[PDB]
Amino acid sequence: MTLLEVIIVLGIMGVVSAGVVTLAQRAIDSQNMTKAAQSLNSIQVALTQTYRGLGTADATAASKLTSGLVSLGKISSDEAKNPFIGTNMNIFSFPRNAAANKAFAISVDGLTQAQCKTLITSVGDMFPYIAIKAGGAVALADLGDFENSAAAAETGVGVIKSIAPASKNLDLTNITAVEKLCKGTAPFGVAF
Amino acid sequence: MTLLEVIIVLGIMGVVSAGVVTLAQRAIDSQNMTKAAQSLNSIQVALTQTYRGADATAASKLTSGLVSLGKISSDEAKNPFIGTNMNIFSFPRNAAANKAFAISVDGLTQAQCKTLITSVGDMFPYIAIKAGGAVALADLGDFENSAAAAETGVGVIKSIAPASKNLDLTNITAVEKLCKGTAPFGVAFGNS
Amino acid sequence: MTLLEVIIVLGIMGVVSAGVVTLAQRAIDSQNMTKAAQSLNSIQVALTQTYRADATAASKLTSGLVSLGKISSDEAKNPFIGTNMNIFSFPRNAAANKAFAISVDGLTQAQCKTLITSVGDMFPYIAIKAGGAVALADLGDFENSAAAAETGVGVIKSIAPASKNLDLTNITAVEKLCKGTAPFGVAFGN
Amino acid sequence: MTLLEVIIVLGIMGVVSAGVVTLAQRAIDSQNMTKAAQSLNSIQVALTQTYRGLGNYPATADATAASKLTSGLVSLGKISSDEAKNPFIGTNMNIFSFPRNAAANKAFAISVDGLTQAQCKTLITSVGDMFPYIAIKAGGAVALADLGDFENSAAAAETGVGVIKSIAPASKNLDLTNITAVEKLCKGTAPFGVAFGN
Amino acid sequence: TLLEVIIVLGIMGVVSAGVVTLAQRAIDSQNMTKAAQSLNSIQVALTQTYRDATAASKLTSGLVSLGKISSDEAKNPFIGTNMNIFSFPRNAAANKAFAISVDGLTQAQCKTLITSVGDMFPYIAIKAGGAVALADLGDFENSAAAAETGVGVIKSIAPASKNLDLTNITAVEKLCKGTAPFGVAFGN
Amino acid sequence: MTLLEVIIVLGIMGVVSAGVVTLAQRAIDSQNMTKAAQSLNSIQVALTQTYRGLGNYPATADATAASKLTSGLVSLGKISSDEAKNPFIGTNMNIFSFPRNAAANKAFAISVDGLTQAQCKTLITSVGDMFPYIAIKAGGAVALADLGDFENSAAAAETGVGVIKSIAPASKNLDLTNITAVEKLCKGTAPFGVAFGN
Amino acid sequence: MTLLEVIIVLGIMGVVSAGVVTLAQRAIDSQNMTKAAQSLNSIQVALTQTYRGLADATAASKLTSGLVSLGKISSDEAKNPFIGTNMNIFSFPRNAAANKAFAISVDGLTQAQCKTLITSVGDMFPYIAIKAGGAVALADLGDFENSAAAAETGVGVIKSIAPASKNLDLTNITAVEKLCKGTAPFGVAFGN
Amino acid sequence: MTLLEVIIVLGIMGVVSAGVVTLAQRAIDSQNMTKAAQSLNSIQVALTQTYRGLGNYPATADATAASKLTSGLVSLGKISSDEAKNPFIGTNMNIFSFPRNAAANKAFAISVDGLTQAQCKTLITSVGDMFPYIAIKAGGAVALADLGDFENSAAAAETGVGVIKSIAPASKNLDLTNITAVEKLCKGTAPFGVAFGN
Amino acid sequence: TLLEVIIVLGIMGVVSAGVVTLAQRAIDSQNMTKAAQSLNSIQVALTQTYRGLGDATAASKLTSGLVSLGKISSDEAKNPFIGTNMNIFSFPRNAAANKAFAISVDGLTQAQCKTLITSVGDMFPYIAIKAGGAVALADLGDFENSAAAAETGVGVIKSIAPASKNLDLTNITAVEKLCKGTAPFGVAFGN
């Protein structure tokens, strides 16, 4: 019976239960991804139901507009908080096709490289306009035009996805689009 | 295996079934507001059919008469936020009584007030806000003589007479000022 | 081998068994907490869908809501002590009888801590009554009370913006959860 | 009481010590196979969750491109290195992409190389039911040319080479209640490279 | 003959000594397994609900208070004292990572714990002749690991780092060089 | 490691399996009730479109002829077969008439009979107050003479068998907030025969 | 050690393996019980979701295989875990109305298995019949509505909807002791 | 304890982890089936309400023209980029125009890709009620010549292959509710192709 | 000879008998582990099933019924030391009839009593001891109103009463003065 209990514990008993932490991390990150997807869908439907009448300047005005949309009752309060920091999402506006204040931007600040890649690969379909700021929060100058800004996905910075007829749109079947995606330095600033 | 079982039971199954009741809150609020939107337009079309060609007690008796007249079903005549019929107010159009009418909804919270002013109101030229309780007959200013300013926060907010300004959905000051003050709030929708 | 060596590796199995038994106790406590969370969420959803006084009235309302088929049978009894949960109709922001609070009473201190940590997000209003059971006069309004977490007794989460909402990264107030004597009436309202 | 003691010691101690390592070999192999199947099912789930929601899969060119694509995908956070660590060679597994019904970028195949004969048979009889397309390459790593078309396969279990399990009607599949199917299975030379495709 | 029972008892004594030594080794292995299970449950509990030595003591007391971790789980099976859990900066972000710091280890206990929980944590730090201090730890995602010093951060998650090896005997011999009490930190 | 898998199959795997089943039963019963509500609305609107405008509601004879009238309305194609097939027994409704102030053949009543006492509560709730006239018959069935007029039958609470809510000026109608209302309704035992008149 | 020590030790080596065998038996039993409960619930839902608006054991097996083919139930749950083959659903008359009621037949169980399956899945069926000491047959299925219950017998009909049936008390330990009386193999027919 | 019990509990964890792949497979299959159910109705409604007033339909005699017709229908806004995708293969379906009443190009046919036997029976039992004509082929997908006449071809539901539900005078009455007809569906070789004629 | 035979047979007899007691001790430790796991399983089954609902022969009947229900196995019900099934006693707590229960094991000596206590008693908030025989249904007082003075060794030694002085299994002087009396002993664990 002896010389068997030692290996029986020191192998199986420890190693069979050690692999759970990775799956717990993945489960928490996937829960946050689903919450972020639901929040982005809610913000998009609120935008196409409120700003559709064809009507912010800085981070302060962005927070003001976010808190107003919260107080408006158009979106639920908790769904306005970021699933990464817990604070209200940054909402900006930028000209669309050289027409000032015609497009909208949803800026999620304080993202790591892994978070950047995961969230963008998750929700790349909902927004034709997607931008990244490596090591910096999103601002008014960072946002280009919705159509007059060409995308160069080789660097994975700035406007990576757009509908301009020069944009290297993100591909889910290109390895260079995987490796170069969200390149730079943290904190990454993703704007939808 | 009991490890990661503690978490498949705790959180991963408890967080998913959390916040959906807030989404259910929003759904029920919008549904009550949905039929309420189609409960005001019916009165609008009926009164524009009838009268286009007084006090609170007279207001209530006229409302009950319009209900009993068969021009409106008891369902649409009932205010879903209160539990009774909505307040109908016939007000003069350039000192001409019975040539204009206004419908007042009272007993709503600031959140319900803002949501209702957003979801309805853009079908009625005259809009007023009486906070702290029911609206008075004197508060129902003449439509063609009224002047409006969304920054006032209390009183008339929208009119067509060439001395007014209307609501903006990109102005945080316009948002926060919507029926700001003490409860209950009362909002009037006026028509000729 | 010698019976000495055989009995040497015979209590090691007992130690592993005691460890796994403690782990199972913890897991079953967590399962009871999950049951409680699901029951509370179901009560909240049913109350919000169907609609829109004292402890005896609360028990009568609970029995009526069970008979109306809005909830299952076990969704009324206490997930810990098996008593019918109290559903109180208490005023909200100077408006009477426009707020509902589910009162799970008779908990221990560990029950306090774990149930609060489980349902901190399901309900926007959390209250703690110590030294016994909750009351209607004990519970304030939904918005007329500034929640205080450093006290460890009373309201710990309210929607009134004049309070500081309790969070899990705060260790001080969490250390003082259900400070007092048993029982511990804990009310969650929406 | 001298011959007695020596006989008891030799006999019983030897016979009790012998079986320990023999059954511990089986235990270690079983736990390795278990974690391998878990990680492989995790890779399959991640790939059919992320890249099947679109409808296509990235293109591979060779073993280098396959390994680079695997490293890129695992770096993305969809999976972890602990889940991509091949428990038979310690490095990462290979992920190739081949056409399904002659439509490129539609079929994928996770290939693991470095198995012995017994390891080949064990891994097959343990996981082959999960994946509808099972292929074998004896004495070599699985390449892109070694993977034929999805439904144009003609798997022959008695050969033990190439594809063995196919959903195509032009072939049969491994039957766990047939000793002739398994005795001819994993018939060749090491290192074996097994490919599980979807 | 009388010499028969003499050699019988002689040959019994060596088996007795061997089984006592093997029982001692088994006791050490059981203690190490209990420690590993406690550390794993600590990791798992901290993953949920969250995603100097005074702060660590307060944190473990609050966690055993909330029932998230058992009392036996927090007490080190080698000293009977609450294992200090330190929050330390990660990638220039302060107090967003967590490391379990255990103290009261010998060198054999050090080797055993490291070799047992190497697969358990992607971050390993050693403090020779003392306990892990709050300032002892650096950044969690940028500090390069020192795979040869046998002390400090030897297993780090930074890409520039080079983790520990379990196949080279010299690497195993280089493990955990210093004096007691040893303080070892496992972060994630 | 053993006795752990056992108290995992029984610890949570046993209890969470029964918990899902109960909620699944509740969800399926609620879906059947919502289908019955949709059926009620469809039959209501179809009848109030076809046999309306003129003062001719089809002359209702004894219960068998009421079932025949229902079958004829189905055969006419104005209502779908499943809509007129109750989701509780799989039979056809009983489309009775009601003398609207001693005026026979001037009203219509969709009768759903043969249900348990528990079903009565949610049945009243599921359709709510869409039907103005509400009636129930406990421990039996509903016929033409089994109920009074449409606008003269007084509504009350303790009634049980009889009227609950009517357009008549009899106050204290159906209200979900009154605990005495939801208590006294559906008093008795099956067969509960409820009548939704309009 | 004197060859008696070793014999004693080897005697203590057989009790450990027998305990492992018994624990594996219990684990298999619990897994099969969970599988059987879930499958019974799913099959009842499938049958009462497509046949509510509308022979021998061989015909029962044929119709079960067709229901698996119908896509209402899967192949894994259709197989009774205790026997390794597909379950049987008997089309028996409901108050002399053939093909209007069903009863799922489970066979090959003993006293403990029958009792556990009953106390676990009794609530989901309004008819409980247990044929003790043999297989099942179409004859053993009386009218679902006209047959009375026999609780004290511990065999056959114990739960029925007839107005004079012996009302089943699931949680009554007295009736629990009287459950699944007779010999093995038992056949449990859950009717509806 | 011992080490064989470790192997036992490892194999039990392996079984409980092998159940989840079948669970997820059935889930994703039910999802694809539910999507195809509405896709068939969308295709039928669009094709009817668009090209019924023109008498004839665009002549397609190969997969290329049919796929281009599907792309044109997507461009016409009658269907979207997600509705036109066949959830089994992954790409757009094949919409052929097949003869009717001895005259060619008078009706249209919706041909699915390669389906299995479970897919056969699920799809047909769920969708065939919304289509007058049904044809099933084994091996490859239904071809052009395989598409018989809409009104001038008898059916054969006992063989499972060929015409399974037609409206010719000699067509056997298809009892889509009797399990005896269901058990005789596409009894042949996989994959299978199904064409809904309307 | 005369020297060798007698002394060698005596020494062989001494060394032969020295292992039977050790085998008995090993079997007793196995029985202790089995009983601890069985008591844990019975506690789990009871607190899950008979919480929202609520003599010797009756106790054995409840034990056999719980075995029949499948929540507990047949193995984990047989009292290993006596081969019978463990008693399950129903008794009120704070005048709440049948809302409390206590599983009773009987037929133990002092060493078995102390070992079983110090092993399993940390799970149950109620421990009682009866000496000389089995725990009678009347011997079990209130689950909550019973003050616990562990110095007695027989009677209420662990409870949740405000005046109850809880045990200390680590304390040596407590366990040394525990379970005092005459064997066989009976110990009840309650919830």
XYZ file of N, CA and C in Angstrom, chain H residues 43-175:
399
model
N -37.925 32.394 -48.363
C -37.679 32.139 -49.781
C -38.996 31.939 -50.521
N -39.891 31.126 -49.954
C -41.180 30.878 -50.594
C -41.967 32.171 -50.770
N -42.085 32.959 -49.699
C -42.885 34.181 -49.751
C -42.297 35.159 -50.758
N -40.976 35.353 -50.714
C -40.333 36.283 -51.635
C -40.533 35.846 -53.080
N -40.237 34.578 -53.378
C -40.360 34.089 -54.746
C -41.790 34.222 -55.252
N -42.768 33.826 -54.437
C -44.161 33.942 -54.848
C -44.520 35.398 -55.103
N -44.477 36.225 -54.054
C -44.912 37.612 -54.160
C -44.082 38.432 -55.138
N -42.970 37.903 -55.645
C -42.193 38.628 -56.641
C -42.445 38.136 -58.062
N -42.355 36.828 -58.303
C -42.397 36.290 -59.656
C -43.634 35.446 -59.942
N -44.714 35.589 -59.167
C -45.933 34.880 -59.536
C -46.701 35.603 -60.635
N -46.638 36.934 -60.665
C -47.330 37.698 -61.688
C -46.676 37.667 -63.052
N -45.454 37.149 -63.152
C -44.752 37.044 -64.422
C -44.936 35.689 -65.090
N -45.667 34.773 -64.461
C -45.896 33.465 -65.039
C -44.699 32.544 -64.927
N -43.622 32.881 -65.626
C -42.411 32.076 -65.634
C -41.390 32.627 -64.645
N -40.326 31.859 -64.451
C -39.220 32.199 -63.574
C -37.917 32.203 -64.364
N -36.896 32.912 -63.884
C -35.602 32.905 -64.578
C -35.066 31.492 -64.752
N -34.725 31.153 -65.993
C -34.298 29.800 -66.324
C -32.901 29.536 -65.776
N -32.796 28.566 -64.872
C -31.522 28.131 -64.317
C -31.353 26.644 -64.587
N -30.198 26.268 -65.140
C -29.924 24.879 -65.490
C -28.628 24.378 -64.863
N -28.109 25.083 -63.862
C -26.867 24.696 -63.207
C -26.762 25.444 -61.885
N -25.779 25.038 -61.077
C -25.603 25.643 -59.762
C -25.177 27.102 -59.856
N -24.417 27.461 -60.893
C -23.922 28.830 -61.016
C -25.069 29.818 -61.197
N -25.966 29.540 -62.146
C -27.084 30.445 -62.388
C -28.011 30.510 -61.183
N -28.193 29.387 -60.485
C -29.041 29.387 -59.297
C -28.434 30.237 -58.187
N -27.123 30.107 -57.963
C -26.469 30.914 -56.939
C -26.483 32.392 -57.308
N -26.331 32.703 -58.597
C -26.430 34.095 -59.024
C -27.847 34.628 -58.859
N -28.856 33.777 -59.053
C -30.232 34.184 -58.791
C -30.446 34.457 -57.307
N -29.864 33.626 -56.441
C -29.935 33.890 -55.005
C -29.268 35.214 -54.655
N -28.094 35.479 -55.233
C -27.418 36.750 -54.993
C -28.264 37.923 -55.475
N -28.920 37.771 -56.626
C -29.808 38.817 -57.104
C -30.997 39.033 -56.187
N -31.522 37.951 -55.610
C -32.620 38.084 -54.657
C -32.169 38.807 -53.395
N -30.947 38.531 -52.932
C -30.400 39.283 -51.803
C -30.272 40.758 -52.164
N -29.778 41.042 -53.372
C -29.639 42.429 -53.808
C -30.990 43.119 -53.947
N -32.052 42.359 -54.215
C -33.390 42.920 -54.362
C -34.040 43.280 -53.032
N -33.364 43.047 -51.909
C -33.926 43.359 -50.614
C -35.029 42.438 -50.142
N -35.403 41.428 -50.931
C -36.398 40.468 -50.467
C -35.841 39.589 -49.356
N -34.548 39.273 -49.413
C -33.862 38.527 -48.370
C -32.572 39.261 -48.035
N -32.010 38.932 -46.879
C -30.817 39.590 -46.375
C -29.613 38.664 -46.508
N -28.457 39.162 -46.062
C -27.222 38.395 -46.164
C -27.208 37.186 -45.240
N -28.006 37.198 -44.173
C -28.053 36.073 -43.248
C -29.178 35.097 -43.560
N -30.283 35.579 -44.134
C -31.408 34.697 -44.430
C -31.085 33.720 -45.553
N -30.282 34.139 -46.531
C -30.014 33.311 -47.699
C -28.961 32.240 -47.452
N -28.275 32.267 -46.314
C -27.227 31.292 -46.050
C -27.836 29.969 -45.605
N -27.412 28.883 -46.245
C -27.809 27.551 -45.815
C -26.973 27.169 -44.601
N -27.593 26.991 -43.432
C -26.805 26.768 -42.210
C -26.024 25.465 -42.206
N -26.333 24.526 -43.101
C -25.611 23.258 -43.124
C -24.292 23.383 -43.879
N -24.353 23.742 -45.163
C -23.126 23.928 -45.932
C -22.401 25.191 -45.482
N -23.122 26.306 -45.385
C -22.520 27.556 -44.967
C -22.732 28.687 -45.951
N -22.982 28.346 -47.209
C -23.099 29.308 -48.297
C -24.551 29.316 -48.786
N -24.854 30.231 -49.707
C -26.201 30.373 -50.241
C -26.697 29.065 -50.850
N -28.014 28.879 -50.805
C -28.648 27.672 -51.317
C -28.740 27.744 -52.839
N -29.420 26.768 -53.436
C -29.623 26.705 -54.878
C -31.117 26.770 -55.153
N -31.546 27.822 -55.842
C -32.953 28.063 -56.135
C -33.164 27.763 -57.614
N -33.714 26.590 -57.903
C -33.963 26.168 -59.271
C -35.411 26.434 -59.668
N -35.624 26.580 -60.973
C -36.955 26.686 -61.562
C -37.224 25.385 -62.307
N -38.201 24.624 -61.833
C -38.479 23.290 -62.335
C -39.840 23.246 -63.020
N -40.044 22.309 -63.945
C -41.275 22.310 -64.745
C -42.522 22.094 -63.903
N -43.656 22.460 -64.495
C -44.951 22.378 -63.833
C -46.033 22.203 -64.886
N -46.905 21.211 -64.678
C -48.009 20.918 -65.593
C -47.494 20.662 -67.010
N -46.440 19.849 -67.100
C -45.760 19.448 -68.330
C -45.055 20.606 -69.027
N -45.099 21.814 -68.473
C -44.427 22.972 -69.040
C -43.284 23.397 -68.129
N -42.155 23.753 -68.733
C -40.955 24.067 -67.972
C -41.003 25.485 -67.414
N -40.270 25.689 -66.317
C -40.065 27.008 -65.714
C -41.377 27.669 -65.298
N -42.350 26.872 -64.860
C -43.606 27.412 -64.359
C -43.657 27.507 -62.840
N -42.820 26.753 -62.131
C -42.742 26.799 -60.677
C -41.277 26.893 -60.261
N -41.046 26.976 -58.951
C -39.703 27.087 -58.404
C -39.481 26.013 -57.349
N -38.209 25.687 -57.126
C -37.815 24.661 -56.172
C -36.687 25.176 -55.292
N -36.801 24.919 -53.993
C -35.788 25.295 -53.014
C -35.016 24.035 -52.649
N -33.766 23.955 -53.092
C -32.933 22.774 -52.897
C -31.925 23.045 -51.789
N -31.974 22.234 -50.734
C -30.988 22.303 -49.661
C -29.750 21.526 -50.086
N -28.660 21.690 -49.344
C -27.410 21.008 -49.638
C -27.444 19.594 -49.056
N -26.275 18.967 -48.946
C -26.166 17.642 -48.367
C -26.642 17.563 -46.929
N -27.643 16.726 -46.674
C -28.191 16.538 -45.340
C -28.102 15.073 -44.933
N -28.052 14.845 -43.623
C -28.011 13.497 -43.074
C -29.436 12.963 -42.927
N -29.581 11.827 -42.240
C -30.901 11.235 -42.042
C -31.661 11.926 -40.916
N -30.983 12.209 -39.801
C -31.598 13.031 -38.766
C -31.957 14.404 -39.313
N -31.058 14.996 -40.104
C -31.354 16.270 -40.747
C -32.518 16.128 -41.722
N -32.510 15.058 -42.532
C -33.668 14.690 -43.343
C -34.960 14.864 -42.570
N -35.096 14.067 -41.510
C -36.387 13.899 -40.862
C -36.780 15.144 -40.080
N -35.828 15.761 -39.376
C -36.116 17.020 -38.698
C -36.614 18.069 -39.685
N -35.834 18.329 -40.742
C -36.200 19.366 -41.700
C -37.561 19.090 -42.323
N -37.800 17.851 -42.757
C -39.047 17.567 -43.458
C -40.233 17.669 -42.505
N -40.149 17.026 -41.336
C -41.268 17.055 -40.405
C -41.533 18.461 -39.887
N -40.535 19.345 -39.941
C -40.748 20.708 -39.475
C -41.218 21.659 -40.568
N -40.890 21.397 -41.835
C -41.105 22.379 -42.885
C -42.143 21.945 -43.920
N -42.296 20.644 -44.183
C -43.103 20.183 -45.302
C -44.544 20.653 -45.293
N -45.063 21.066 -44.134
C -46.437 21.556 -44.083
C -46.609 22.831 -44.898
N -45.556 23.641 -45.011
C -45.608 24.906 -45.728
C -45.215 24.775 -47.196
N -45.300 23.571 -47.769
C -44.945 23.365 -49.166
C -45.800 22.254 -49.755
N -46.308 22.428 -50.977
C -47.162 21.393 -51.576
C -46.374 20.224 -52.148
N -45.190 20.495 -52.688
C -44.368 19.481 -53.332
C -43.068 19.301 -52.565
N -42.648 18.046 -52.422
C -41.414 17.696 -51.728
C -40.727 16.582 -52.503
N -39.428 16.740 -52.742
C -38.627 15.721 -53.401
C -37.318 15.561 -52.646
N -36.908 14.311 -52.440
C -35.702 13.991 -51.688
C -34.832 13.069 -52.528
N -33.530 13.345 -52.544
C -32.563 12.553 -53.285
C -31.439 12.127 -52.352
N -30.887 10.946 -52.612
C -29.765 10.425 -51.851
C -28.456 10.780 -52.550
N -27.344 10.422 -51.912
C -26.035 10.757 -52.435
C -25.830 12.251 -52.576
N -25.719 12.728 -53.809
C -25.577 14.145 -54.057
C -26.885 14.892 -53.867
N -26.824 16.194 -54.128
C -28.004 17.036 -54.033
C -28.899 16.834 -55.251
N -30.166 17.228 -55.100
C -31.117 17.127 -56.201
C -30.604 17.925 -57.390
N -30.631 17.304 -58.564
C -30.131 17.916 -59.781
C -31.282 18.558 -60.552
N -30.988 19.019 -61.769
C -32.017 19.630 -62.605
C -32.982 18.577 -63.137
N -32.449 17.539 -63.785
C -33.297 16.484 -64.330
C -34.055 15.743 -63.235
N -33.467 15.635 -62.042
C -34.137 14.948 -60.941
C -35.431 15.646 -60.543
N -35.539 16.945 -60.806
C -36.733 17.712 -60.458
C -37.859 17.345 -61.416
N -38.774 16.495 -60.957
C -39.916 16.109 -61.756
C -40.912 17.243 -61.910
N -42.010 16.934 -62.593
C -43.033 17.941 -62.842
C -43.793 18.271 -61.563
N -44.199 19.536 -61.440
C -44.896 19.987 -60.238
C -46.267 19.330 -60.112
N -46.990 19.195 -61.226
C -48.310 18.581 -61.226
C -48.390 17.293 -62.034
N -47.314 16.884 -62.705
C -47.375 15.718 -63.581
C -46.335 14.674 -63.195
N -46.227 14.373 -61.904
C -45.306 13.348 -61.429
C -45.848 12.752 -60.141
N -45.959 11.428 -60.104
C -46.406 10.743 -58.902
C -45.287 10.702 -57.865
N -45.675 10.460 -56.618
C -44.747 10.420 -55.499
C -44.521 8.985 -55.043
N -43.508 8.816 -54.193
C -43.193 7.512 -53.612
C -42.602 7.764 -52.228
N -43.453 7.709 -51.204
C -43.030 7.978 -49.836
C -42.514 6.741 -49.112
N -42.733 5.546 -49.663
C -42.270 4.330 -49.005
C -40.791 4.064 -49.261
N -40.265 4.509 -50.404
C -38.851 4.321 -50.705
C -37.962 5.358 -50.032
N -38.504 6.530 -49.706
C -37.728 7.600 -49.120
C -36.913 8.418 -50.096
N -36.705 7.936 -51.318
C -35.931 8.659 -52.314
C -36.860 9.089 -53.441
N -36.390 10.053 -54.228
C -37.172 10.575 -55.330
C -38.259 11.526 -54.882
N -39.448 11.389 -55.459
C -40.576 12.243 -55.105
C -41.230 11.691 -53.846
N -41.277 12.508 -52.798
C -41.818 12.083 -51.515
C -43.187 12.687 -51.226
N -43.548 13.796 -51.868
C -44.877 14.376 -51.700
C -45.184 15.195 -52.944
N -46.164 14.750 -53.723
C -46.580 15.442 -54.933
C -48.093 15.622 -54.908
N -48.611 16.298 -55.932
C -50.030 16.594 -56.052
C -50.633 16.006 -57.320
N -49.926 15.083 -57.974
C -50.472 14.383 -59.122
C -51.693 13.563 -58.702
N -52.577 13.233 -59.649
C -53.758 12.430 -59.288
C -53.412 11.075 -58.695
N -52.272 10.497 -59.065
C -51.838 9.216 -58.528
C -50.941 9.361 -57.305
N -50.798 10.571 -56.770
C -49.935 10.784 -55.616
C -50.550 10.175 -54.363
N -49.755 9.384 -53.648
C -50.188 8.838 -52.369
C -50.357 9.962 -51.356
N -51.470 9.940 -50.627
C -51.741 10.974 -49.637
C -50.706 10.926 -48.521
N -49.916 11.991 -48.405
C -48.847 12.058 -47.412
C -49.435 12.406 -46.052
N -49.363 11.462 -45.117
C -49.795 11.687 -43.739
C -48.575 12.126 -42.940
